[PDB]
Design an enzyme around this catalytic site. Structure first.
Site, short mmCIF file in Angstrom:
data_model
loop_
_atom_site.label_atom_id
_atom_site.label_comp_id
_atom_site.label_asym_id
_atom_site.label_seq_id
_atom_site.Cartn_x
_atom_site.Cartn_y
_atom_site.Cartn_z
N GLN B 33 0.84 -1.22 0.00
CA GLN B 33 0.00 0.00 0.00
C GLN B 33 0.85 1.25 0.00
O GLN B 33 1.97 1.19 0.43
CB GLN B 33 -0.94 0.01 1.20
CG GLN B 33 -0.22 -0.27 2.51
CD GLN B 33 -1.10 0.01 3.70
OE1 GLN B 33 -0.90 1.00 4.37
NE2 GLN B 33 -2.08 -0.84 3.96
N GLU B 99 -4.25 3.41 -0.53
CA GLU B 99 -5.09 3.65 0.68
C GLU B 99 -5.35 5.15 0.78
O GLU B 99 -4.37 5.94 0.83
CB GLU B 99 -4.37 3.15 1.92
CG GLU B 99 -5.09 3.50 3.21
CD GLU B 99 -4.28 3.22 4.45
OE1 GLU B 99 -3.33 2.47 4.32
OE2 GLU B 99 -4.58 3.78 5.52
N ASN B 103 -10.09 12.04 6.95
CA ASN B 103 -10.30 12.62 8.30
C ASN B 103 -11.63 13.40 8.24
O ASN B 103 -11.67 14.43 7.57
CB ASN B 103 -9.07 13.44 8.71
CG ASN B 103 -9.13 13.96 10.14
OD1 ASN B 103 -9.77 13.39 11.02
ND2 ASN B 103 -8.44 15.07 10.36
N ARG B 122 9.47 19.43 0.42
CA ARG B 122 9.36 18.28 -0.49
C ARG B 122 9.56 16.95 0.26
O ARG B 122 10.23 16.90 1.31
CB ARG B 122 10.37 18.45 -1.62
CG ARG B 122 9.99 19.51 -2.63
CD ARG B 122 11.09 19.62 -3.66
NE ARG B 122 10.71 20.53 -4.73
CZ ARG B 122 10.67 21.86 -4.63
NH1 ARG B 122 10.97 22.45 -3.49
NH2 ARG B 122 10.29 22.58 -5.66
N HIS B 126 5.07 11.34 -6.15
CA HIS B 126 4.01 10.84 -7.05
C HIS B 126 3.79 9.34 -6.89
O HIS B 126 4.66 8.64 -6.35
CB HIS B 126 4.31 11.20 -8.52
CG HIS B 126 5.64 10.74 -9.04
ND1 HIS B 126 6.75 11.58 -9.09
CD2 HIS B 126 6.02 9.57 -9.62
CE1 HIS B 126 7.76 10.93 -9.66
NE2 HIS B 126 7.34 9.70 -9.99
N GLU B 172 2.09 10.08 -12.34
CA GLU B 172 2.86 9.85 -13.58
C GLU B 172 2.03 8.89 -14.43
O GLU B 172 1.49 7.92 -13.87
CB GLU B 172 4.24 9.28 -13.26
CG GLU B 172 5.15 9.13 -14.47
CD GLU B 172 6.54 8.73 -14.03
OE1 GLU B 172 6.91 9.20 -12.98
OE2 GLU B 172 7.22 7.92 -14.68
C1 LIG Z 1 7.32 16.95 -13.54
O1 LIG Z 1 8.05 16.78 -14.75
C2 LIG Z 1 8.78 15.63 -14.92
C3 LIG Z 1 9.20 15.27 -16.19
C4 LIG Z 1 9.94 14.12 -16.37
C5 LIG Z 1 10.29 13.29 -15.29
C6 LIG Z 1 11.06 12.06 -15.49
C7 LIG Z 1 10.79 10.83 -15.01
C8 LIG Z 1 9.76 10.58 -13.91
C9 LIG Z 1 10.37 10.46 -12.50
O2 LIG Z 1 11.31 11.21 -12.15
O3 LIG Z 1 9.89 9.65 -11.76
C10 LIG Z 1 11.48 9.67 -15.45
N1 LIG Z 1 11.36 8.50 -14.87
C11 LIG Z 1 12.06 7.52 -15.55
C12 LIG Z 1 12.09 6.16 -15.22
C13 LIG Z 1 12.84 5.30 -16.00
C14 LIG Z 1 13.55 5.77 -17.10
C15 LIG Z 1 13.52 7.10 -17.45
C16 LIG Z 1 12.79 7.98 -16.66
S1 LIG Z 1 12.56 9.70 -16.84
C17 LIG Z 1 9.86 13.68 -14.02
C18 LIG Z 1 9.12 14.83 -13.82
C1 LIG Z 2 0.58 6.01 13.59
O1 LIG Z 2 -0.21 5.06 14.30
C2 LIG Z 2 -1.19 4.38 13.63
C3 LIG Z 2 -1.75 3.28 14.25
C4 LIG Z 2 -2.74 2.56 13.62
C5 LIG Z 2 -3.18 2.89 12.33
C6 LIG Z 2 -4.21 2.10 11.65
C7 LIG Z 2 -4.19 1.61 10.41
C8 LIG Z 2 -3.14 2.06 9.40
C9 LIG Z 2 -3.65 3.18 8.48
O2 LIG Z 2 -4.48 4.04 8.92
O3 LIG Z 2 -3.23 3.18 7.35
C10 LIG Z 2 -5.17 0.67 9.94
N1 LIG Z 2 -5.22 0.23 8.71
C11 LIG Z 2 -6.25 -0.67 8.55
C12 LIG Z 2 -6.56 -1.34 7.36
C13 LIG Z 2 -7.61 -2.23 7.36
C14 LIG Z 2 -8.35 -2.47 8.51
C15 LIG Z 2 -8.06 -1.83 9.69
C16 LIG Z 2 -6.99 -0.93 9.70
S1 LIG Z 2 -6.38 0.02 11.02
C17 LIG Z 2 -2.59 4.01 11.71
C18 LIG Z 2 -1.62 4.75 12.35
ZN LIG Z 3 8.24 8.32 -11.60
ZN LIG Z 4 -1.93 1.97 6.00
#
Ligand SMILES: COc1ccc(/C=C(\CC(=O)O)c2nc3ccccc3s2)cc1
Ligand SMILES: COc1ccc(/C=C(\CC(=O)O)c2nc3ccccc3s2)cc1
Ligand SMILES: [Zn+2]
Ligand SMILES: [Zn+2]
Lengths: 183, 185
Positions: B33, B99, B103, B122, B126, B172
């Site tokens: 997830q 997921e 809230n 930052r 994505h 993306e």
């Molecule tokens: C917001 O604008 C952009 C434009 C291009 C990119 C390039 C990416 C995406 C990323 O950084 O995740 C690329 N990802 C891959 C993955 C494998 C091979 C080449 C690239 S370029 C990222 C942000």
């Molecule tokens: C930072 O502490 C916590 C403790 C428990 C949780 C509970 C979660 C995780 C989440 O919110 O992503 C739960 N996830 C699921 C998924 C399915 C069923 C029950 C739960 S409780 C989240 C943050």
């Molecule tokens: Zn990417």
């Molecule tokens: Zn979770």
């Protein structure tokens, strides 16, 4: 429509009524990657490969723009193609990959760190790993010096943990068979 | 160690030397997830199901703490178990689920919005969807009124797009077969 009291959650019926069936133009879409920025790829690669057991399936370097992309996944290294074209096409068609972005230099900047999204301003919360046994996974994590946000038996929801990676990103550690009891 | 010129990031052999083989205690781990907080689940559910074609595989409500969890995935709805316990175990053992955390109340606060991590400060950038055809997927997205961060033929890297979801999170849109050509360019 007249004004309504505070709604609460959506009901199951309400949520279902906001969902459409998948258009056939989307039938081959897949959720391929989650991208996190990392200060230090050496520490990040050691954490994701040694501690969590992921495989590095692809490294991409952009010498002019000065960044690297690392693709990590739960894949058998024996399935990684040898030919670089085939390798990139295989790597980027894997489901459930983690893309780490290294902006060259951040590892040498003492005032730099990324934001994990779990304090103001919030957005992204976590990635999650399904494990067969949360307690034994977390015992191993303890022994390897992993920093915990939530130990499995701390807080209200038992059987569920959160660790953090070298950048402080939260990682849920969950057992799918124990999530039913948590309801 | 003597001081070094500015780092050019890792060489392949440097990166490889930072990687260990998978300990057998991790062999069944899976990346299950990615969790994003959403202001308005009605808009988010409509976007991820109708526009992107994901399936809602599980909804969880916590009436005392006042939040809901929505699990989205690319799954055939015919594979969703009918019995609730089996359903939750199946849903939460699917790879590559999204997921969404609602809230309760955020949809009624005009000054509230989540941060997408792509401006200060930052972190997360994505999620990414692999598609057979970026240009046809993006034509459909345009017609459905989807907001774009990057059209496929804008910027330096052609053949790759970024859209945003109702909270402004970046998605993306990529074709795995066209990412190899982008390396040599
Ligand atoms: C917001 O604008 C952009 C434009 C291009 C990119 C390039 C990416 C995406 C990323 O950084 O995740 C690329 N990802 C891959 C993955 C494998 C091979 C080449 C690239 S370029 C990222 C942000
Ligand atoms: C930072 O502490 C916590 C403790 C428990 C949780 C509970 C979660 C995780 C989440 O919110 O992503 C739960 N996830 C699921 C998924 C399915 C069923 C029950 C739960 S409780 C989240 C943050
Ligand atoms: Zn990417
Ligand atoms: Zn979770």
């Amino acid at each position: 429509a007249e004004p309504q009291p505070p709604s609460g959650g959506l009901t199951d019926e309400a949520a279902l009524s906001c969902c459409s069936d998948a258009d056939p133009s989307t039938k081959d879409f897949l959720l391929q990657q989650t991208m996190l920025r990392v200060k230090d790829p050496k520490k990040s690669l050691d954490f994701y490969t040694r501690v969590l057991g992921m495989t590095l399936i692809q490294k991409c370097d952009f010498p002019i723009m000065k960044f690297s992309l690392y693709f990590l996944a739960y894949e058998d290294k024996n399935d990684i193609p040898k030919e670089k074209d085939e390798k990139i096409a295989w790597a980027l068609s894997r489901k459930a990959t983690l893309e780490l972005t290294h902006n060259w230099g951040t590892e040498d900047d003492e005032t730099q760190s990324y934001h994990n999204g779990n304090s103001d301003p919030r957005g992204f919360g976590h990635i999650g790993i399904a494990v067969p046994d949360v307690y034994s996974a977390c015992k191993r994590f303890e022994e390897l010096g992993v920093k915990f946000v939530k130990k499995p038996d701390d807080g209200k929801m038992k059987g569920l943990a959160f660790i953090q990676d070298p950048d402080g990103y939260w990682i849920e550690i969950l057992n799918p068979n124990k999530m039913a009891t948590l309801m």
